[PDB]
Amino acid sequence: GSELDQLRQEAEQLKNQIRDARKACADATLSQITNNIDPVGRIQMRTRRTLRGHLAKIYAMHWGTDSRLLVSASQDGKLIIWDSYTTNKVHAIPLRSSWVMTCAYAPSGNYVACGGLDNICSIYNLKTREGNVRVSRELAGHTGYLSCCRFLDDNQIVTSSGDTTCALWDIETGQQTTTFTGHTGDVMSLSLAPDTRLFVSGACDASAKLWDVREGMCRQTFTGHESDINAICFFPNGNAFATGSDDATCRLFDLRADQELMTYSHDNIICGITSVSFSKSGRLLLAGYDDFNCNVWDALKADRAGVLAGHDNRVSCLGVTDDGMAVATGSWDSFLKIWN
Amino acid sequence: GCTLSAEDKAAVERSKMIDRNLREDGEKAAREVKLLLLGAGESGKSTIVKQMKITGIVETHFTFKDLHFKMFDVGGQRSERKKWIHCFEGVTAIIFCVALSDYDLVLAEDEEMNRMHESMKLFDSICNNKWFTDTSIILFLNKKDLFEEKIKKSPLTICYPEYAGSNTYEEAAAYIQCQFEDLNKRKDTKEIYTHFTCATDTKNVQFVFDAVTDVIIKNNLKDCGLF
Amino acid sequence: MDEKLLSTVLTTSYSVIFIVGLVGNIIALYVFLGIHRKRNSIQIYLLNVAIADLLLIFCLPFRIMYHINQNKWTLGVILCKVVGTLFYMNMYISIILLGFISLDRYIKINRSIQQRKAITTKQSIYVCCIVWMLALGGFLTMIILTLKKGGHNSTMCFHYRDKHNAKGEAIFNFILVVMFWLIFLLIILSYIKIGKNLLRISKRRSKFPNSGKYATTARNSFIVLIIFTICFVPYHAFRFIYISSQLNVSSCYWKEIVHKTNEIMLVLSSFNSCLDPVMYFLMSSNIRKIM
Amino acid sequence: TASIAQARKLVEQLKMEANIDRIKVSKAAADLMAYCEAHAKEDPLLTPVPASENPFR
Amino acid sequence: VQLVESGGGLVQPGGSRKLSCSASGFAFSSFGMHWVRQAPEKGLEWVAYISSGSGTIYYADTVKGRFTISRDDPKNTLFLQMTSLRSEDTAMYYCVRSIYYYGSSPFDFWGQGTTLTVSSSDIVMTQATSSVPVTPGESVSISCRSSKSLLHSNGNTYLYWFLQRPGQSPQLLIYRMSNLASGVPDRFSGSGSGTAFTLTISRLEAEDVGVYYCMQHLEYPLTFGAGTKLEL
Ligand SMILES: CCCCCCCC/C=C\CCCCCCCC(=O)OC[C@H](O)COP(=O)(O)OC[C@H](N)C(=O)O
Secondary structure: OHHHHHHHHHHHHHHHHHHHHHHHOOOOOHHHHHOOOOOOOOOOOOEEEEEEOOOOOEEEEEEOOOOOEEEEEEOOOEEEEEEOOOOEEEEEEEOOOOOOOEEEEOOOOOEEEEEOOOOEEEEEEOOOOOOOOEEEEEEEOOOOOEEEEEEEEOOEEEEEEOOOEEEEEEOOOOOOOEEEEOOOOOEEEEEEOOOOOOEEEEEOOOEEEEOOOOOOOOOEEEEOOOOOEEEEEEOOOOOEEEEEEOOOOEEEEEOOOOEEEEEEOOOOOOOOEEEEEOOOOOOEEEEEEOOOOEEEEEOOOOOEEEEEOOOOOOEEEEEEOOOOOOEEEEEOOOEEEEEO | OOOOOHHHHHHHHHHHHHHHHHHHHHOOOOOOEEEEEEOOOOOOHHHHHHHOOOOOOEEEEEEOOOOEEEEEEOOOOOOOHHHOHHHHOOOOEEEEEEEOOOOOOEOOOOOOOEHHHHHHHHHHHHHOOOOOOOOEEEEEEEOHHHHHHHOOOOOHHHOOOOOOOOOOHHHHHHHHHHHHHOOOOOOOOOOEEEEEOOOOHHHHHHHHHHHHHHHHHHHHHHHHOOO | OOOOOOHHHHHHHHHHHHHHHHHHHHHOOOOOOOOOOOOOHHHHHHHHHHHHHHHHHHHHHHHHHHHHHHOOOOOOHHHHHHHHHHHHHHHHHHHHHHHHHHHHHHHHHHHOOOOOOOOOOOHHHHHHHHHHHHHHHHHHHHHHHHHHHOOOOOOOOOOOOOOOOOOOOHHHHHHHHHHHHHHHHHHHHHHHHHHHHHHHHHOOOOOOOOOHHHHOOOOOHHHHHHHHHHHOHHHHHOHHHHHHHOOOOOOHHHHHHHHHHHHHHHHHHHHHHHHHHHHHHHHOHHHHHHO | OOHHHHHHHHHHHHHHOOOOOOOOHHHHHHHHHHHHHHHHHHOOOOOOOOOOOOOOO | OEEEEEOOEEEOOOOOEEEEEEEEOOOHHHOEEEEEEEOOOOOEEEEEEEOOOOOOEEEOOOOOOOEEEEEEOOOOEEEEEEOOOOOOOOEEEEEEEEOOOOOOOOOOOOOOOEEEEEOOOOOOEEEOOOEEEOOOOOOEEEEEEEOOOOEOOOOOEOEEEEEEOOOOOOEEEEEOOOEEOOOOOOOOEEEEEOOEEEEEEOOOOOOOOOEEEEEEOOOOOOOEOOOEEEEO
């Protein structure tokens, strides 16, 4: 058809123009400019606390906003709240579905979000007059496994599922106020901006997309990976982010430049990255692999500076405190470790 | 502890009580059998569940002779299988259902590829997975009565051009069973259980119970070191 | 008091036993701490058995050196008295651990009819710790007691001791012999019951070509029971006349022949202690596949 | 008569992303380095603080 | 949520009695229980404490070896058995719930109270004043003092402020000397350091008339302060 041919040629011309515009703004590289700075020495971290009590593989965790409490989820059917300072358990929530794959902590400390592989996102209220934790709202409407959920405030939450669609919900009512579509493969992870105005998502089609909470449509798309994307995280500044994939390669993308800056990979690593996180100052990039240990990279020189060995199975979750005092890693051996 | 105040020892006692409750609840979840269910969609898994009946994940819990079975059906998911299959690594057994009347039938989307070839490819993919290298597979063959009714009107040579036999019920059943069992590549770590479905629930329940008991006793003998 | 043309066979036996046991205990030592991560009770017991046998192996070269030069000691009586005590303590610890292994194996197979078992695999550490502490206490007590009397010459070492007029050492050896006649009964009853139950399980069904349940009930348990019964019993069977021989004296011919027979029993027991590690590779299918 | 709408949506989305202002890579690199240098003093993981302030001592 | 206690009445000096209270509206099996005594025209007085699961039981030195405390979770009931009753046991008895974990606020609900009449080291906590006549529209400051410092190594300061309206059960206002309770106006504030503590109230109305008590929870036994009265 003439219309189909003209649409295809218009799309090809637009893609070529976008590629040419991206190439035009490429004058130098991050490594060459940064090479003049003094590299940081070897980083030594030792475990302090060991959190035990789970009886199955741990799939998600999230640090509290006070840098003292955390929450962990595992397939045994329990959601456990840990006090890191004294290694005490505050609450243990029995789940209706044991196939949990994500969890999230409210920024105010009153609610906890749970979900995964059940098309239902549950909200649990911690501050109750009756003295027990009870579910307050069940959100439904997805047609695929739930992969990630993040709080915005006490009445807003953003979720991503396996149906190639992200949703912004309203807890009080229970209806999707905004839907984001455009991904081909399944959506695996999302990251919220510090100002809670934009967020980014990574999909199984080796792509990442920058969305808009207030507007509701995609803004920019980033490519470069050769396999599935499993993790994503914003820079502390908020003008760049990092992606981890299954081809033993991490990448750093810039929102303002809309291009690639640095690539972190080694010839001795052939496994897949499972978690990606940053530091308080944005200098250390922590990557949790499935080779039973985590790695620490220099975000400005792409040189490895430490390995956090100590886990006997896959490392699936990793988190860094708001004040940057410690880092918590979880694994499939039902053990959590705190490093500093 | 001596440094702990009066408001810190009560927290320790509460944590110990939580630990005791978790330990008590964890020993009851290991006394139940977990069975994954797979198939070809319309291969007849629904009627198999119906014979032994008491969105993405369907759970069926039922007891028989003081033994509890929990069965996970994942038919209504429609997602990427490789991104969540490792969640079912610790299942006791995987049930795979095959219809005997699909050899003449073809796929609705395309008539080039038979339903039998698709079922065989699915069985080969599931059996040789890296996560299920030591998990038992129970193969059910259903819709045998209609297959027997229609066997005379169409030779099996349409589905298998290289077949040369008496074109009777026993020979065709043995040939199909052998072709399904020949797809195994380990032959030392896992075995395939084959049964022909009947109209009586008791036979199917007894076969499932015997299979799971044999799997459990073999596994525990292997862990004991004698086997 | 002549012992000639007899030290040669002892030197030729112990020389082979030392090297083969050392190889077996080095190859099978890191297995329980290497590939294996979630150790079970049986694995922990086998690791402790290997550790106990490793120390028993180290006592062999001292006796080899004693015999080989010319039937004489040159290092004092304290070393001889401590080497013998470690040898005997290691042998008895190995026997006790084997009995506990059989007792533990009796439960898992005969209880798996209903369901699996629980986290109870923690008592093994407590049992091992308490038995090791008791063995160390007995070792220290024996060393303290034997040196009090004194009156020994630095020429007599691994040799028949005159008598037991100073009673107190031969009465302690009469207790460790009654202990072997209770562990052995438990072991034989447990293994016979396991074999019979598994053989009956293998019967009653003929549809599936189940042959694995058939090999383990006959060629794995019965062989171990037969080996234990044929190569541990004679030593303790002959230890009854020996005690009466060290409490009532007779002509030197009888003393010499009973000492020679007792020495042969120790060689047989050492051979069995050496052969115990190697049976793990052949019996275990997964270990054999890995190795 | 159905894929035409999908093609129109795709070309509209492609056109939407082709009208965004971009800056030089060097400026972004300089901004990142400046932020890192400014905030390096407040990173407890890069600079090991004395054990008198670690809550996990 | 409500606690209802009973078992009152007048008895001779020689006799044994049982006080029974029932809870309804919350998980009775997750809250530790306290018994509090109040003599007529006097202040409060701690009596006994039982933990969740009957793990730790604490008694008062005055009634040690003479009072028994029992808990029934099947029936959601608390029992207090008294064997020997002297002439000083005539008072009002309350039942208090308290849950201890990181961030919790003990001493939430104080029950209703029952009357018991009979015919015929520790930390000293002091109240500065005893009666301060005031008028609505002005701030009121109340001072409390402790013999020993209530500050711990972790930084917590176990101080609790209470208020008893005329004819009403006491209610919690401030816990740990700095944290405001739930359901009270933001006007109430508390502060202080070391052995000195201050409670300030602003924009008083006519309904804020009662007695304020300062209590320490550093170590058992729990000692209540004196009573400061306010007038309209
Ligand atoms: C709680 C039970 C488990 C642990 C057991 C620990 C207690 C016993 C374990 C070890 C005890 C240590 C040794 C004392 C108890 C048993 C040993 C014993 O009878 O005389 C051995 C004594 O030294 C003499 O040895 P010698 O080399 O001179 O000659 C021997 C010659 N072949 C003989 O045959 O004449």
